[PDB]
Structure 1
């Protein structure tokens, strides 16, 4: 059963909820981690940590540094997993 963009939609957002500091009110599609969500680059690291083991891939620091907005992850793992529908 191939997955869709909406299949990622929840699943990227879902794995983000597990982090304790992130506030349930401040999540959004375009929400800024550093400014809106209020993270640090260190805090930017482990929301990546939650994200590849959940989906099952590996993203290096070559690209892990600018995926900061939640949908910036979605449009990224879409091309990594070739989900284009």
Structure 2
């Protein structure tokens, strides 16, 4: 259950245009990181490759929280 967060944290910092040590689970891609709308899209996609599950077009819109992403991936 945390293992998901372990992976999710690994994916966010690897792209390197985000989380320069400011990575936080409560941190929101759009709300505080400032990462672009599109960049988020890239992120969700990224998570999909490591998880091995492709999340739908819409639910990407609701999760801007890594922690919430782990919430959904566990489901």
Q: When the two structures are superposed, what TM-score results if normalisation uses the length of structure 2? A: 0.88
- State the shift of 1:62 in Å: 2.1
8 A Cα contact 2:5 2:66, kept in partner: no
Unmatched segments (≥5 aa) in structure 1 = 79-84
Give the paired residue count: 75
Rounded Cα–Cα distance in structure 2 between residues aligned with 1:33 and 1:23: 9
Unmatched segments (≥5 aa) in structure 2 = none
Name whichever structure is richer in helix by fraction: 2
- State the shift of 1:23 in Å: 3.0
Give structure 1 regions of 4+ aligned residues with deviation exceeding 6 angstroms.
none
Q: CA RMSD in A?
A: 1.7
Q: When the two structures are superposed, what TM-score results if normalisation uses the length of structure 1? A: 0.79
